[model samples]
Target chain A: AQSHSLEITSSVSAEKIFSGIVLDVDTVIPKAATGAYKSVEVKGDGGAGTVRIITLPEGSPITTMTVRTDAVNKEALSYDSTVIDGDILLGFIESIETHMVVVPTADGGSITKTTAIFHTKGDAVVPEENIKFADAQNTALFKAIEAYLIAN
Target chain B: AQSHSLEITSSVSAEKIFSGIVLDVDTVIPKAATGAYKSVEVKGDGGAGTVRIITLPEGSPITTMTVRTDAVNKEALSYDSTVIDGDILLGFIESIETHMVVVPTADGGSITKTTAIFHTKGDAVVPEENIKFADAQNTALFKAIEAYLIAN
Candidate 1:
């Protein structure tokens, strides 16, 4: 088992950041972090129970991730998801469970914290690059929301 | 300036609650608090720069509120709106700005808080009833999200 946690404080409100990504992800993520994610597709109505397939921008050997939304709580501004299918898994990882929490600060801003657990397949060691990739994606998403809030 | 703020903590995550309300207000709000709101209508894409009209249930002197979504940041899980047209304003109140924040707690739950500021005309005293109404609506909205999260 491998795990990594990342935290950041955004000047934007927690509610805005949480909803921006979870509710309007298909529209906002593609626009916000265009450099990282080429496109995000959702077959369902982008609700609690939907599968999200995210395609990376191009040139990467690992192309896409089919993620299942395991749990979603709009009131708490948190959600848990797992990657069920993706080339990035490389058969070494059994699954990846991601838990995200966005909390508000005293100044009307938000603190975003994410914890990802990699369930390995038979003593497989998770690559450092894989952890970094997940962290980088989340960082980019948060920054995009910050920029949008600041501009508007 | 008269203002009212309410706070509640729920077992569900802040992301789920915020997204549920912002993304599917029409379905959730009416279902959660059937006594308060009859229906909710959104014009445009229901994003930041749109209008959402919420209709009250029968017999209320204030039938509806035409609200302009001033700012929305799904990243921060926060949005700001003002009641542009409503009998609740009663000509004395110039505008009502409502700000909501959802913070995640250590226990994997969330704290939902709301702050509402009533901007009034010169020398106008904002009525206590107006403030109470705003508080009541927000309280209902938050509780509705909590119920939805728990059930799902």
Candidate 2:
């Protein structure tokens, strides 16, 4: 497994950030950073154990990401997801599992930690380009949410 | 005209908060304070020239507020709205107009100022109850956004 992790502290509170991660993510991801994603569609009940299809913008190798929600704990403000299908599968490894943890900071803000684990197909290692791309996308999502929460 | 004005400072940037008021208000208002409003719907192009209908929760005299956007200035980070029809209008004398101004504070935050002007007809005074209600609603909206910004 090839893994990557990042932790960042923001001025916004943990609870507010949690709301975006848990409740408003579907809307936040598409609108906050429109350049990255075209749309997000949910099928069946929208909670833990549901599936969300994230459609990427044109000119990308992968067209859609079928993300399965593995675990969602509102109390702890954390969730886990795995990409079942996408370019991540076609380009390099087998699966991409991701987790996000948010905890309140001392200053009434929040500290968010995210980790991504890539399971490669026999003899395949995750590419540096892939890791960089993932990091950039996550950055866009956080920036958009932070901007929304601060302004509204 | 009977008017009420208030000003408060928050630890969020003025430009970010301005984006919320101009673009993300429909999402912010209900999500921030779900108990107060059931839903928000826009009609006719949804900008300074549009109408937004806010549906209140059950048992309230005002079921819906059909608000007309009088002005929206992105540069100044300000907007104005007036209640065209609602139970508040039926009980009150004439019209209620509201305005909000958000500016950057010295500490990388923002100073938000709000004013409500009541134009009553013939012997009717702006009720204290109305003032309190409006204050509570605005508080919910700001608090939610602040919480989100601080945590995330």
Candidate 3:
């Protein structure tokens, strides 16, 4: 399959974190991610057409990524987006679509679920390296955000 | 009345925090309390009749406190103790009794409750100054423990 999915838990409630990603990610990411993200450039309101340019660290193979928001559904804590332009494409991959959902757990925690789908050009096979790398990065982001949310 | 009561919340689950207060408090207090407590000496098993000698900061009016545990109920996350000796008595006070409880919140969080009762020498009025000071110290301890619980 051309999909990468992840699940993580947080002690913070879903609502407190749900809207923050869309409304204030530019501000929160720097604090949560520490040195991982150099900067985030957001254009337009955080809506369906909003675009984001995320700059990575100096030593990264993919220096920057440009992503367009597909949806920011508030009702159920769902955020959807697509990578439009990025060095992470690695030539053969045309684009990557992502969906993020945060659901409440019975014990007053949250379960975060994320899925990323890669669309290839000319039926190119997606590399396992990309999946693993993305997972590592996303895992760190989730944990950092979780700690920040709980502490705050 | 002759009691001081406090309530605080923590993102850490009640079970994860229940036994830690009695079983490993000697280890956790140093890290969590930072500059508040100089040292803690335990004289018995973390159970009934256990004695604790807690050394306070250098400049504090109360240099050290000697308390004996009356009960450590793991099933309900309840800890009860009595302060047998301490400079915190401030001349008129005889001893102090303490009870701590942690209950699970609906949202995977914990609510911490503490009540401290003061016994004065010959019906001496419990000073408001002592109550306020105890509340401040207990509040700080609760917050520090909460942050440590969430972070770890």
Candidate 4:
């Protein structure tokens, strides 16, 4: 399986970025993504072990997705969320897990290392084009959110 | 053990109240309690499953305490936190568990029901004075936070 990865830089502290993702994603993601997401809602209080429900636009291939935050450690500045239930699986892939780690640099800026992995069913191999598409989507979303956070 | 409990009113919705308590308690409690707690720090991202380390003022019998967030449900407007470690235990009680539920009322107000339970090491009974003290302390803290939220 190909590694769908991206490294994005942000002009914010790691704590702010981590908290914004862990706690305020429901409120911030929709605003950043604009018309891409129908809704982003969190069921529990916040952070790790909580589940989030996300709905996409009408014409999108993936209508809705439920994500489970397996690990969200603020001290480590790392997060791992898996799409446990979603139409994006396309009935063939098992799950899509995204692990992110935010590191603060010397200039008060932060670098985000993100890796998205696809778990296929029965040893199936995901196409290279699919990995490219996933990487592009993630890059677009992260950059948009980074810009929104900076502006706000 | 006596039912060490108190019910206070808040001029805010349950969601905001819950989030303020679950997410911002570390920052809010210190400002609200003023001089009572030396520091209140959360050790995780936020919300349920996070452990909070609280330090008390000088010469206080209870020097420091650690609390574990057992249940923090936003939808149900309920929270359960337990004192897992600290000098506050006094070497007698097994642990102290506090369960709270916030219900929204008409006129944009909320009624919070809070109960503090002391689980002893042996079958020892806690003093009625202790219960009263706990109730008074809880009342003080809650009312201070309530006022702070309304003013903000």
Candidate 5:
């Protein structure tokens, strides 16, 4: 191959900071926190009416998220994910209209736009944190792809 | 190879300079100072006179200088060169020794106490003239080495 193409994005919704790019995952987590952990008053009562905001009933972690995309190549993709069980989600993009898209960072102002080709030997996974780990991993993988290109 | 190694200097005597390295070479003359214009000036005087001191009969171009060094990593280096004749000098490396020495450029100062490597590479018979030619040839040779290292 002339070059390698990889894409990674966040596994959780609203966790835009960690989604839509390569993943810097070193290991897989059993489960990630999904819902907001604050409680809202159920009824306006001073005593017995008090209510506690309950966390997600601690049970089995989410196994995956449905991604409407193709693994090989398709104009529109749709598929179910078994990875993001509770906290995050997972999906494979079969086809993307644009090769790259700019994503804004959480702090605002800064943006990260990414694009990718279909069937290329690259991966995109939503991260739990910023792109530092993802980019560092990219550095090595990029070089390896470069070396392979040179050899051919 | 993990990293490419270049022989910046050999223990050959070289001319050192403040800004960059330089070497001065002169053609040799026989005892009688007779023969071609280059040979006639064995003890020729400088300045105006009945026969002005002629520098090398005025026609023959300086011959190529050939340099030989027992550089550490030269055992299997393939030789490549360009330019046949004319004076040549190299800046950056001065003299040779047991090991090659290279001081990176700095903002304000330079090295002061390090000893230079071995003696200059000089041709016993041609001396200065040989070195001049060798300088240019060496530069081209180095380029070839660099390309080879980068390639295979």
Candidate 6:
């Protein structure tokens, strides 16, 4: 099936998404690279459940960043920012995954894929150049999903 | 080689999840299905790095919901209720693309594929009769992944 995965090794700055960029269901046209990212409404049901993708040219300070997230589910996807003993100010996001698959044949064919939606709460550049933190999230997210599908 | 494609669309909801009816990773164990409705779990990972899947019946009242999700890294997946904002929200999910291919020879067979994952948010509702939400999302996700292999 259409699948994907991700691997995060850093403490990730969740605050970046708190006030840095404007998001949509299609793509995030980042205005600032810092101060925490934020989302703006576009009308009806187009704000929360959206994945915005941006690509970075080669030779750039970084390659890419991908952020794919769902609007928010109150059922089992909810979470707490603190763990009782922890005071590190953590921001947690619920899990909402969506997949779309297309093939020319029944069970045999090549693979072409793209990320459709996502959300982010981290910074792209706290110490260096992270013009578009969402871009970094997108690139990494794409790979994570690819790895997830391949592993299966 | 064997493969499939998929298309996934999701929305977030805060309406208390009923004891019956499927949404997210939650599944009705047949016995849980009563004449009135069914009970579901809407599987979740609990953290920002987790994955979950929500499901819905073919002829149910809800149009779209979480079909499925997975928590790859155990540490990344979490589930705490303190962070919840509303009652029990719904995450709408839909998948619309897929591709796949397999090469079989006298020796054996090798397969390749490609796929896309799309995300969108919306309220909770039911689709038309005979139209299975889970079935549609499942088909789309598989098809998209299979297509990816064929092209690669």
**Best TM-score among the predictions, by candidate number:** 1
lDDT of 3: 0.71
Clashing residue pairs in candidate 3 are: A107-B108, A108-B107, A108-B108
Ordering by TM-score? 1, 3, 2, 4, 6, 5
- Kindly report which residue pairs in candidate 4 clash with one another: none
**Number of the top candidate by DockQ?**
6
lDDT per residue (tens digit) for residues A1-152 in model 3: 48888776555678866744555677666654445576788898888999989987665546789999999888889999999887888777788999999999998767889899889877688876566556544554554454445435
Instruction: Report the lDDT tens digits of candidate 6 across residue range A1-152.
Output: 11122222212111222111112212323322221233332323433534333334445443333333434332222211111111111232222233221113223322222222222234311221232343366445433433333343
Error of 4 at A87 (Å): 2.0
- Model 2 CA deviation exceeding 4 Å by range: B1-152
Ranking by lDDT: 1, 4, 3, 2, 6, 5
True contacts kept of each: 0.00, 0.00, 0.00, 0.00, 0.00, 0.27
**TM (B chain), model 5:** 0.24
Q: Global lDDT of each model?
A: 0.73, 0.68, 0.71, 0.72, 0.24, 0.28
lDDT of 1 by residue, A1-152 (tens): 56666777777887888878676776775566667777778767755578978788578767888998877778667777888888878877778888776765546676676667888877788888877776776687778867865675
Q: State residue B54's C-alpha deviation in candidate 4, in Å.
A: 26
Which window of ten consecutive residues has the lowest lDDT sum in model 5 chain B? B17-26
Give the true-structure RMSD of model 6: 20.2
How many backbone clashes does every candidate have? 33, 9, 3, 0, 54, 155
lDDT (10s digit) by residue, model 5, range B3-42: 1123332111121211121111122111101122333221
Write one digit per residue (lDDT tens) for candidate 2, span A36-132. Answer: 4667778756567888888765644455788888888888889898888866576766788999899998888788898988887777887654565
**Ordering by DockQ:** 6, 1, 3, 2, 4, 5
Error of 6 at B90 (Å): 38
What is the clash tally of candidate 5? Answer: 54
Query: Cα miss at B22, model 6 (Å)?
Result: 18
lDDT tens digits, residue span B78-144, model 3: 9999998878777777789999998999988788798988887676887654565465445445544
Error (Å) of candidate 3 at residue B106 is 36
